[PDB]
Design a protein around this ligand. Structure first.
Ligand SMILES: Cc1cc2nc3c(=O)[nH]c(=O)nc-3n(C[C@H](O)[C@H](O)[C@H](O)COP(=O)(O)OP(=O)(O)OC[C@H]3O[C@@H](n4cnc5c(N)ncnc54)[C@H](O)[C@@H]3O)c2cc1C
Ligand SMILES: CCCCCCCC/C=C\CCCCCCCC(=O)OC[C@H](COP(=O)(O)OCCN)OC(=O)CCCCCCC/C=C\CCCCCCCC
Ligand SMILES: Cc1cc2nc3c(=O)[nH]c(=O)nc-3n(C[C@H](O)[C@H](O)[C@H](O)CO)c2cc1C
Ligand code: FES
Ligand code: FES
Ligand SMILES: [Ca+2]
Lengths: 251, 198, 446, 408, 387, 204
């Protein structure tokens, strides 16, 4: 019958293509995962202040100096777990691991906050010199993600880096400008009364201020985004309890 | 109810498939000569996409999703072949059903079904669906809205090209060049919904 | 009553005096061969041939059996041929008084005659060319029939004559022509007139429909669109009141009636009035010593739809009932386009001339501008009473889409139906020629 | 290796299920019965076909050969049929070649109709009477430097019934012919030797079908006379191959075998008492001779006729004897020949120049009414264009200009 | 000098065919009547630009700082040289000088570049250069901030003339608005010289928001003029004592100019009424349903009219005959869509303060479909033998 | 021969003459590296698909021909996707959806149907490489122009010093958006049909 030839052709073709596809796919999963992790590793290395070129140097210096850890937002305590492969965005998406935010608390317009978040500790020897808090917030066209490196004293910022911004490349995408990023080194997060104090000043910052950093020019709708991002992720439902525990002592 | 109105209006206006995502341009730029054939092709695309998105959602969530069948087994590398096969099979079977049982519907819009058996619009729709992780009802609404937006765009371009019978285009741009420039001006116009977040 | 509100009564100086006075002697007539739409003639005469009245001059190759006969007896003196030997006129010099006569009936019997006998006498005499079908404005085939025959007993053209003045003179002939049409008209006859009473036909086929409004409220195309819309399947014939008088006289007396009463008027005519003439008379002899000194244009018909009567075409057309003379304007003006026009006419309101009411203008033949593209500022809508989309149909005519124009209503129009649209165009387009091209394409492809 | 097995099995299963559902939907919801092609409503003759195929190929495999010349790609446009109810659509090439006047009555191209519905045809009675013939060659003698006369012999005491002005197609097997094998006399061999055409040759692999116009009026029985020209490579590219069927016919000699297939025609003399004007040139002498001899012998008409033949030189003038006989016996027929460039050996005392200009200057300029005549025209494309231009300039309607263009 | 033979003198031609008498109007009369209607807007725009600049300058600097600042900018020292003054007591003449120093270079650049491109195209296609470019040039030069770079104006007018109009066959043969397609080129390409707080008052070092950006942030109580420290009233935006694009600020002047071209039959009162209907309906709906966080949800219909470039575009740019709808009902639908989209982009779109160029560019795309619907409803009436 | 490779570059161009292949040309031309990688991937997939379809041209059933051809094409594109994800991870993240849309790319299927089913294995490879070159011509031209004018960079190398990194050039923000690709391709078509006037589409 004519069914025999068509069935034979289809079966043989599917067998060959299946062997080839499934052999090529399963064989490279480990390389794909390594590549996926390498980008975030390089970003955290760049924020921490370390210099590394190439996959080998990146992986070596990341295993040497940086130690990922999980922290509970509601209580500000470290929790045991596999902090290396934790995925905070899926943790926020899933309902059992996240909470819905009210309009009085959702200052950063994220609409969902996870219960456990990862923080990276920069270590020189046994002592921890910096903690790299991951923060994010909404802007005018997209959700902006950042890596802020807070020193051990709990206030002084040692750097900033936006690794996912998605805004106009010459108005509000200046959050990736090296000068704007370097404007952050030395600023203090909290005031004397342990309150959030970072201020995105519109029109220039008074030279010498510790809480003032220059706002973006021609983009006040994406400077409000950074201001609200820090207003939320420095508050009581963000890194507030953890930062209080760090400021007290015993990082 | 308010969650699906947002998806409908989004897929129709805020995220156009033709002018914003550039899906299916060859037929969009070739069959745009007459409003009648453009309307027929738009209806065909609406039907095919509305049928194709939810069936592929079912197949994905049942088989291809990580750990769906057996824990620790991820068969996500079959997404492309599975989607394209389901699309082609559904298109062919619908073409045959309409040609046999409903000759009027066939001579109306089933004449276009061979053109969209393998079209970037539907494949990109299914890919965006698996990227955005829609439920079944969200897949239905997204497919319908995307089809309606594609049809609106192609019918607008057909109306413009039929108004352009009074134009005097240079010989080098007569044909494809002026159509490209017209679609570009249409995208420049459709950029009105840029800042909206629906 | 059908009341038209979208139109334009063009104010032009020289409105004629509605009294009929005898006219100057005519010594040459002619049959203009280019005014008959889609005709290719077979000449039955030669230069130097003595003819009699209603003797055949040429036949149509495309319309088998239609005979074009001489208006008067005389001698064929010219056969003017243009570019590609296209016929322009057959000029006959009036002489003698011979004629070809036919069968005469009593006025009682005219409504009961047979359609075949009526058709036979009409085609033998040459009044079959008085009809014009719609669509395509051609002479009807001798083997075809029509349900709607429209008699145009009104005239809204500028400087036009008054139908009532002539019908009050030959009421018996008008009624006889109506009664003959009643037996030729298998469906019906429509006598489209104004509010003023006319002679009446006792037959129930003959109906009197009153139209009231500015131009084009007196056009057979408007009458057809409002009483019997035409298409490829439904065709209607149109004859005017003077040709109906002539048909009545023919069927009553047995001899052709070639007399005409036309309107000689214009901004450059000394004493505008109505004059008695003969079909196809010589216009350069008709306006001899009745024009102001200068350079003028003589036109057969109105200024909206006429024929420049110079040279071989300086003869009264078949379907024209007036002569319009107006000065020829070629002068250049410094910043004339930007003048506040107290003496300038427009359908827009960008001039001061619209503020003064009842003003008549000494218009000339100037195109007040140069040819440009169509920027539609809403002009063609103010002058189109019919139920069409004016600017879309005109833009499809300009583009050259004949199928789209037939869809949008080009099969209901004559070159006289777009005269106001040609008038009010800021791009100086001419839509009658484009309509004729579209209709030629439609007639050829089929 | 635990994922690879699931991958191969899942891929095979999905593809197999898709293929099987496709086949199952095709089996049930696609018809496979029979379709009847009623070629005419009156007779019982109807053809049963499967839905897969073409209307033209179906009619051919049945045996009713419609009139076509090229045999493919709609380049001919002669495979016309009238369908009352059949394949309900019209193709762009059909819009290109026919008008809406042919649509309403039901005419349609036989080449591009899809046979999936029950069809009702109305063919002209001419298509029924087209027999496939076998013939022997009587003579293949030259008449001009590039024109060669082929006289076939129709067997079994029958004559092809055809109107004057028709044609018959010719078939040929695959072959390979040498130009040196041509039989060319020494008088016409001049330009042959001078251009060195004998180096050419032609090779074909498949049966070929070309058409040629009969050169005798139907009363001349038993003989089929043709006039074929040698279609040498054009002077722009002398490197291309030569003509196939022209070389085949030039290869044919006495006693050989060749086939002709049915009388066709679309170029006939109109019925009227009007003056006739025959404008011929090149190989158009064949239909022109058919027409004139038909008129003067079979119908015995008294219409004022004329003939104007244009050649290059007196060497290319043929058929002078019978035309002198006709012009002498009848006072209706008068024929004039015009030489483009006569040689010194010609000793020519007559009309010289291009035939359109000669006709216009000598006849149509002083003519009373050139628009009342019937014009029959057939020759080279340059002559056709020039004469059509002259006639259209003289105010002549396309319904008087009757034209036959060799492979238009 | 061959152009002076065409522009100064009447052509001097006669008719040839069916209509032996023509109407006195032509394209030149129409285009110059539209070019003259925007002159009050242009002059008030120059005056307002000069006045706002002088006020913002005397607000920031004083004494020795004013001299050093006016010695820097050629606009300011050229005003001082020609005879005006930059002090706070400057009359209406010193302000129009300062506004002309900003408007005239932009207008000259736009005119020269667009004229070059149009002359090139009309020379290559063997046509005569037609009016209809004066309107595009003047509109593009008046819908742009007082502080555009001249190379940006050149690029924008190049894109507007060549790509939007001249590449389709000239005037009357395109489907898009050339002047608003050249501003959409500059808005999406170089969007910082045409947006924000530093481009609208031509004062060196002055940063201030306009009133469709101050309403969004705080409402009707946030309409404050920082230069003078005074509240912005409705009579200020209506008359036009507000910052913005050169000649869009004076709704009174725009009404005075547009009333003439509407009376004369050039502009479409159907399109204007459609725009007003659409904006009133949508603004009333937003005012009814209301919202707490959004402060544009409570802007009345008579505040939408006087702020932004609504009146400029409703009066002079929506009424473009070539890009509008050719049917009398399509015109109503076109205007309604323009107004609806303008109010929508104003209220629910957070990135763009207004929406009149982006609403007209949408309606330019969707007008042929309205004409199609109307003509198709008309054809069914003909097949039924009632038309 | 060599003409079989070099004719689809200008004489019969995919994007510029036979509309096939527009959806990726509009999208992936914002960056020259992505344009180059897409050109290479399209060449690879089209050539190998043509080769295999021509190998099995005779045994392909008619009712499931599309399924067989699309199975081969999808296998090729899936292998390409798994290779790119492992060795060029940054390019694939930007090429996210059009890597998969290589399957529905009209060039691959149109060449597998028009030329592969009716030709030999070796010439099909040549036709595929030629059509890939013709695709990459337009891809690389539009990518060059867009990346140069809109970012001042070529392949990521600073060619024009941007004004924010203390320079003289201010980039074009429209060369990163949707409209610019349509205009670039339309003007490429104009410039192509100017020098080759046999491609001009006759009136009406
Ligand atoms: C109704 C009708 C009647 C006809 N009557 C006659 C008649 O009486 N006499 C007559 O001679 N013809 C007649 N013809 C024309 C006939 O059909 C042929 O067209 C003609 O005879 C030439 O035949 P052929 O063998 O050369 O055909 P072909 O071999 O198909 O034609 C080849 C011709 O084309 C040229 N050519 C082919 N390929 C190329 C190439 N690649 N580059 C350049 N040139 C190339 C050759 O040089 C040669 O001239 C008639 C046609 C029709 C339709
Ligand atoms: C169509 C021709 C061209 C356009 C010509 C338009 C002429 C219109 C008539 C002249 C308008 C003169 C209006 C003078 C305003 C008087 C000032 C006044 O009394 O107050 C205005 C008062 C509101 O004041 P508040 O701001 O609320 O003050 C308190 C603050 N909360 O009401 C108004 O705003 C009046 C609106 C101004 C006139 C609007 C004119 C319409 C514009 C042209 C549209 C054409 C008509 C189409 C209308 C379509 C309607 C469906
Ligand atoms: C009432 C009227 C309004 C016009 N508005 C514009 C406009 O907004 N932008 C423009 O470029 N041209 C405008 N023009 C000029 C003309 O319409 C424009 O050049 C056409 O678009 C030519 O294609 C206008 C003309 C008139 C008569
Ligand atoms: S004959 Fe086969 S296609 Fe025309
Ligand atoms: S790429 Fe060819 S159709 Fe989408
Ligand atoms: Ca969507």
């Amino acid at each position: 019958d004519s069914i025999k030839k068509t069935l034979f052709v289809v079966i043989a073709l599917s067998l060959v293509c299946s062997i080839i596809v499934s052999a090529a796919a399963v064989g490279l999963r480990d390389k794909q995962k390594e590549n996926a992790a390498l980008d975030k590793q390089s970003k955290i290395l760049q924020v921490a202040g370390i210099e590394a070129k190439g996959s080998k140097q990146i992986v070596e210096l990341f295993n040497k100096s940086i130690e990922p850890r999980l922290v509970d937002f509601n209580t500000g305590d470290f929790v045991e777990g596999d902090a290396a492969n934790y995925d905070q965005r899926k943790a926020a998406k899933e309902a059992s691991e996240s909470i819905k935010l009210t309009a009085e608390q959702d200052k950063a317009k994220i609409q969902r906050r996870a219960n456990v978040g990862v923080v990276y500790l920069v270590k020189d020897g046994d002592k921890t010199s910096k903690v790299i808090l991951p923060v994010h917030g909404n802007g005018l066209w997209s959700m902006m993600y950042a890596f802020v490196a807070v020193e051990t004293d709990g206030n002084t910022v040692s750097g900033l880096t936006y690794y996912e911004q998605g805004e106009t490349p010459g108005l509000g995408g200046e959050v990736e400008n090296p000068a704007w990023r370097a404007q952050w080194v030395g600023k203090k997060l909290f005031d004397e009364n342990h309150k959030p104090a970072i201020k995105i000043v519109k029109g220039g910052a008074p030279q010498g201020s510790e809480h003032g950093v220059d706002g973006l020019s021609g983009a006040t709708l994406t400077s409000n985004g950074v201001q609200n991002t820090f207003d939320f992720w420095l508050g009581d439902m963000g890194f507030g309890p953890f930062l209080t525990k760090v400021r007290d002592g015993g990082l | 109810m308010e969650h699906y109105i947002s998806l409908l209006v989004k897929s129709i206006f805020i995220e156009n498939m033709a002018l914003s995502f550039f899906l299916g341009m060859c037929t969009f730029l070739a069959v745009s000569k007459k409003v009648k054939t453009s309307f027929g092709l738009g209806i065909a695309v609406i039907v095919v996409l509305t049928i194709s998105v939810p069936v592929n959602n079912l197949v994905y969530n049942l088989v291809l999703k990580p750990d769906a069948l057996v824990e620790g087994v991820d068969l996500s590398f079959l997404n492309f072949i599975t989607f394209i096969g389901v699309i082609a099979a559904l298109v062919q079977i619908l073409e045959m059903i309409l040609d046999r049982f409903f000759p009027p519907l066939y001579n109306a819009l089933g004449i276009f079904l061979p053109l969209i058996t393998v079209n970037c619009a539907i494949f990109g729709g299914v890919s965006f669906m698996v990227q955005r992780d829609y439920s079944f009802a969200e897949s239905v609404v997204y497919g319908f809205g995307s089809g309606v937006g594609w049809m609106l765009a192609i019918v607008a371009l057909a109306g413009i090209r039929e108004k352009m019978k009074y134009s005097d285009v240079p010989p080098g741009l007569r044909g494809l060049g002026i159509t490209f420039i017209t679609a570009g001006l249409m995208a420049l116009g459709f950029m009105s919904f840029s800042g909206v977040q629906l | 009553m059908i009341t038209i509100k979208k139109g334009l009564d063009l104010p032009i100086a020289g409105t004629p005096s509605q009294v009929i006075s005898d006219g100057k002697a005519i010594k040459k007539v002619a049959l203009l061969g280019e005014e008959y739409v889609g005709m290719r003639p077979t000449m039955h005469v030669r230069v130097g041939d003595e003819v009699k009245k209603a003797q055949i001059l040429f036949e149509d190759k495309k319309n088998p059996g239609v005979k074009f006969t001489s208006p008067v007896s005389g001698k064929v003196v010219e056969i003017n041929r243009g570019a590609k030997r296209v016929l322009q006129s057959v000029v006959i010099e009036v002489a003698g008084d011979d004629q070809v006569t036919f069968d005469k009936f009593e006025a009682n019997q005219l409504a009961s005659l047979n359609r075949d006998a009526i058709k036979t006498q009409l085609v033998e005499s040459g009044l079959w060319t008085a009809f014009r079908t719609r669509p395509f404005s051609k002479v009807p085939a001798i083997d075809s029939t029509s349900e709607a025959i429209f008699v145009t007993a009104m005239d809204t053209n500028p400087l036009a004559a008054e139908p009532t003045v002539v019908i009050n003179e030959q009421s018996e002939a008008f009624v006889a022509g109506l009664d003959v049409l009643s037996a030729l008209t298998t469906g019906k006859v429509y006598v489209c007139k104004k509010g003023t009473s006319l002679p009446r036909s006792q037959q129930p086929n003959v109906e009197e429909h009153v139209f009231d409004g500015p131009h084009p409220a007196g056009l057979a195309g408007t009458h057809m669109h409002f009483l019997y819309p035409v298409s490829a399947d439904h065709v209607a014939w149109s004859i005017n009141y003077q040709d109906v008088i002539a048909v009545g006289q023919l069927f009553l007396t047995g001899e052709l009636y070639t007399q005409r009463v036309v309107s000689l008027a214009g901004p450059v005519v000394n004493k505008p009035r109505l004059v008695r003439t003969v079909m196809g008379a010589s216009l350069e002899q008709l306006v001899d010593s009745e024009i102001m000194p200068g350079e003028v244009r003589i036109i057969s018909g109105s200024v909206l739809s006429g024929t420049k009567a110079t040279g071989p075409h300086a003869y009264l057309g078949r379907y024209h009932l007036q002569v319009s003379v107006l000065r020829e304007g070629r002068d250049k003006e410094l910043f004339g386009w930007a003048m506040p026009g107290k003496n300038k006419f427009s359908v827009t309101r960008s001039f001061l001339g619209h503020l003064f009411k009842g003003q008549v203008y000494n218009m000339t033949t100037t195109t007040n501008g140069s040819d440009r593209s169509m920027v539609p500022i809403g002009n063609y809508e103010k002058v189109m009473p019919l139920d069409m989309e004016p600017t879309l149909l005109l833009r499809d005519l300009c583009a050259g889409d004949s199928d789209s124009a037939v869809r949008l209503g080009a099969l209901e129009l004559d070159e006289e139906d777009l005269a106001l649209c040609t008038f009010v165009c800021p791009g100086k387009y001419e839509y009658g020629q484009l309509l004729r091209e579209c209709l030629d394409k439609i007639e050829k492809e089929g | 290796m635990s994922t690879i097995i699931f991958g191969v099995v899942m891929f095979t299963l999905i593809i197999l299920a898709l293929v099987l559902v496709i086949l199952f939907a095709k089996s049930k919801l696609v018809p496979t019965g029979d379709i009847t092609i009623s070629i005419n409503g009156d007779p019982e003759k109807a053809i049963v076909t499967q839905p897969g195929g073409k209307l033209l190929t179906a009619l051919a495999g049945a045996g009713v050969f419609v009139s076509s010349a090229c045999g493919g790609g709609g380049s001919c446009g002669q495979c016309r049929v009238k369908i009352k109810s059949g394949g309900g659509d019209i193709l762009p090439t059909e819009l290109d070649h026919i008008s809406k006047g042919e649509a309403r009555e039901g005419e349609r191209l036989a080449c591009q109709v899809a046979v999936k519905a029950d069809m009702d045809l109305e063919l002209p009675e001419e298509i029924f009477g087209v027999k496939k013939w076998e013939c022997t060659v009587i003579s293949n003698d030259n008449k001009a430097t590039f024109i060669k006369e082929l006289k076939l012999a129709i067997p079994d005491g029958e004559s092809v019934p055809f109107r004057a002005g028709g044609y018959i197609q010719i078939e040929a097997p695959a072959h390979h012919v040498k130009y040196a094998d041509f039989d060319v006399p020494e008088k016409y061999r001049g330009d042959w030797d001078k251009f060195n055409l004998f180096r050419y040759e032609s090779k074909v692999d498949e049966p070929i079908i070309r058409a040629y116009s009969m050169a005798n009026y139907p009363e001349e029985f038993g003989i089929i006379m043709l006039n074929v020209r040698i279609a040498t490579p054009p002077p722009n590219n002398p490197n291309v191959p030569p003509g196939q069927m022209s070389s085949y016919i030039w290869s044919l000699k006495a006693g050989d075998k060749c086939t002709i297939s049915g009388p066709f025609g679309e170029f006939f003399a109109k019925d009227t008492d009007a003056e006739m004007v025959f404008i011929g040139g090149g190989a158009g002498m064949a239909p022109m001779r058919s027409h004139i001899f038909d008129q003067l012998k079979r119908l015995k008409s008294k219409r004022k006729m004329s003939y104007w033949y244009g050649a290059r030189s007196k060497r290319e003038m043929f058929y002078v004897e019978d035309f002198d006989g006709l012009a002498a016996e009848n006072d209706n027929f008068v024929w004039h020949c015009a030489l483009s460039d006569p040689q010194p050996e010609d000793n020519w005392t007559g009309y010289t120049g291009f035939i359109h200009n000669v006709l216009y200057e000598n006849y149509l300029k002083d003519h009373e009414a050139p628009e009342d005549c019937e014009y029959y025209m057939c020759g080279p494309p340059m002559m056709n264009a020039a004469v059509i231009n002259m006639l259209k300039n003289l105010g002549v309607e396309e319904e008087n200009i009757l034209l036959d263009d060799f492979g238009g | 000098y061959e152009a002076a033979a065409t522009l100064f003198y009447t052509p001097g031609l006669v008719t040839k065919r069916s209509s032996h008498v023509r109407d006195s109007v032509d394209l030149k009369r129409i285009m110059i009547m539209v070019w003259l209607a925007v002159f009050p807007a242009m002059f008030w725009g120059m005056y307002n630009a000069g006045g706002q600049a002088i006020a913002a300058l005397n607000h920031l600097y004083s004494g020795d700082q004013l001299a050093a600042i006016v010695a820097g900018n050629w606009h300011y020292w050229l005003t001082e040289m020609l005879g005006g003054t930059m002090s706070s007591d400057a009359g209406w003449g010193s302000k129009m000088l300062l506004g002309a120093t900003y408007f005239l270079p932009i207008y000259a650049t736009v005119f020269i570049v667009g004229g070059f491109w149009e002359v090139l195209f009309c020379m290559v296609r063997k046509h005569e250069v037609n009016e209809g470019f004066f309107v595009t040039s003047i509109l593009f030069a008046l819908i742009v901030p007082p502080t555009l770079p001249l190379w940006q104006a050149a690029l924008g007018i190049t894109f507007g003339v060549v790509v939007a109009k001249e590449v389709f066959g000239g005037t009357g043969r395109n489907f898009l608005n050339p002047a608003l397609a050249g501003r959409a080129f500059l808005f999406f390409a170089y969007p910082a010289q045409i947006s924000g707080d530093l481009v609208w008052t031509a004062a060196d070092g002055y940063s201030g928001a306009t009133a469709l950006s101050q309403w969004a942030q705080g409402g009707a109580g946030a309409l404050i003029n920082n230069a003078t420290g005074q509240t912005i009233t409705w009579m200020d935006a209506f008359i036009g004592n507000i910052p913005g694009s050169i000649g869009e600020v004076s709704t009174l002047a725009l009404m005075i100019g547009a009333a003439f071209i509407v009376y004369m039959g050039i502009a479409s009162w159907r399109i204007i009424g459609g725009v007003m209907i659409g904006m009133i309906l949508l603004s009333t709906l937003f005012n009814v349903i209301g919202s707490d966080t959004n402060a544009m949800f409570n802007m009345p219909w008579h505040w939408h009219l006087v702020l932004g470039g609504f009146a400029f575009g409703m009066f002079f740019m929506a009424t473009d005959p070539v890009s509008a709808s050719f049917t009398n009902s399509g015109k109503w639908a076109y205007g309604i869509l323009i107004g609806v989209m303008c109010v929508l982009i104003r209220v629910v779109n957070p990135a763009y303060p207004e929406g009149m160029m982006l609403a007209i560019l949408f309606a330019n795309l969707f007008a042929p479909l309205f004409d199609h619907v109307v003509v198709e409803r008309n054809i069914k009436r003909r097949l039924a033998r009632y038309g | 021969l060599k003409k079989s490779v070099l004719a689809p570059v200008l004489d019969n161009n995919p994007i510029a003459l036979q509309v096939l292949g527009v959806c990726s040309a509009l999208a992936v031309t914002t960056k020259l590296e992505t344009a180059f990688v897409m050109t290479l991937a399209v060449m690879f997939v089209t050539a190998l698909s043509n080769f295999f379809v021509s190998l099995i041209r005779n045994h392909i059933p008619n009712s499931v021909r599309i399924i067989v051809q699309m199975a081969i094409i999808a296998s090729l594109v899936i292998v390409v996707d798994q290779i790119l994800k492992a060795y060029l991870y940054d390019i694939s993240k930007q090429l996210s959806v059009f890597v998969g849309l290589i399957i529905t790319n009209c060039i691959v299927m149109g060449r597998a149907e028009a030329f592969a089913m009716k030709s030999e294995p070796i010439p099909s490879f040549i036709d595929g490489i030629g059509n890939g070159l013709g695709y990459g011509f337009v891809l690389m031209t539009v990518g060059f122009f867009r990346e140069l004018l809109g970012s001042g960079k070529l392949f990521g190398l600073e060619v024009l010093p941007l004004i924010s990194n203390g320079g003289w050039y201010q980039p074009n923000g429209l060369m990163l958006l949707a409209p610019s690709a349509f205009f670039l391709i339309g003007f490429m078509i104009w410039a192509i049909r100017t020098f080759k006037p046999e491609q001009v589409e006759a009136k009406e």
